[PDB]
Design a protein. Structure first.
Ligand code: NI
Length: 341
């Protein structure tokens, strides 16, 4: 059964609610982004209207085989009427295709659902500038001050410099990058660009990337692993065993691996600056865990919410324990007293 924080009152709408069977009274199902925790349930057998971005719609069609007649892509930054209600989709600064949804309810209430997001000051000059929001359904993944991590630009600088240095010292090193979902593609695209190589991967991953409207993509990726000195592998193979196993396959072309494991936040952020990060090493294999986040840091979230000044906040992450829910409400009240709304 569909929880309350996935329903939009006064409409026939749900958001990210595909794993509960038929939702009583739902005439349109919104999907914020193509991550499995949110799409859980969709397939070729789905027969209700799905509203989403163009990129999400390409993924639904090609990866889940949802029939074309049930896919409803909307452009961003544009007022659209769906089942007699005005909506807008806004870029969430999460993974490719990810959106926030503004709903202009028939009774005059305005609701913003963030989906998954990485808050940014650029959002203060979207269509949000204009107006009041009565209810914010907020991605609270990192809603506590201990959650600190660098900018994406700093993390990419570190990865580019690390890989360019290694391969310049040893032209026979291979670079490997772990993946498990869409998102974080800049990690492997930036490294391949500094090395003058395409990125090699499986046919399944290549298909996924071909759905993302990335300009000049045919110039950047390939399924010919042997022609490539940046390889992608599933995230679970990014360990000393899995990497040794991979180096055997390459046929004595390479004599070293340098690997990257992009993560979310980890507790070594509480001590170590991005510059100071060191790898785990066994023999001719080195592995770097790098904190490339696509969710808001505490400070980013606080800034966005103190700017928006919503009337009420409904968290959509960390809602399962009394202690979590209690801690989040304390922070929402400080923010409100500090800023005066
Ligand atoms: Ni997500």
């Amino acid at each position: 059964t569909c929880p309350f924080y996935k329903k939009i009152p006064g409409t026939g709408f749900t958001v990210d609610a595909f794993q509960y069977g038929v939702v009583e009274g739902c005439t349109a199902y919104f999907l914020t982004h193509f991550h499995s925790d949110h799409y859980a349930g969709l397939s070729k057998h789905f027969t209700f209207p799905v509203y989403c971005s163009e990129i999400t719609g390409n993924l639904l069609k090609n990866k889940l085989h949802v029939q074309e007649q049930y896919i409803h892509p909307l452009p961003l930054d544009t007022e659209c009427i769906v089942n007699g209600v005005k909506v807008v989709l806004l870029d969430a600064n999460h993974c490719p295709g990810a959106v926030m949804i503004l709903f202009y309810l028939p009774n005059g209430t305005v609701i913003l659902h963030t989906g998954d997001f990485r808050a940014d000051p650029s959002m203060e000059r979207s269509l949000l500038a204009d107006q009041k929001v009565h209810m914010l359904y907020l991605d609270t993944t990192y809603c506590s001050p201990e959650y600190t991590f660098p900018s994406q630009q700093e993390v990419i600088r570190f990865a580019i410099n690390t890989a360019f240095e290694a391969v310049t010292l040893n032209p026979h090193a291979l670079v490997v990058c772990g993946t498990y979902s869409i998102g974080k593609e800049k990690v492997f695209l930036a490294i391949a660009d500094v090395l003058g190589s395409k990125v090699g991967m499986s046919q399944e991953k290549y298909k996924t990337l071909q759905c993302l409207n990335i300009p000049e993509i045919n110039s950047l990726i390939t399924t010919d692993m042997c022609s490539s000195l940046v390889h992608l592998l599933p995230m679970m193979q990014i360990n000393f065993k899995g990497l040794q196993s991979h180096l055997k396959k390459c046929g004595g072309k390479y004599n070293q691996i340098l690997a990257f494991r992009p993560t979310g936040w980890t507790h070594s952020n509480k001590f170590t600056r991005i510059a100071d990060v060191i790898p785990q090493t066994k023999g001719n294999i080195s592995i770097y865990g790098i904190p490339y986040s696509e969710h808001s840091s505490y400070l980013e979230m606080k800034r966005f919410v103190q700017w928006l000044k919503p009337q009420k906040i409904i968290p959509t992450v960390n809602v399962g324990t009394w202690k979590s829910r209690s801690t989040m409400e304390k922070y929402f009240r400080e923010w409100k007293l500090e800023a005066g709304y």
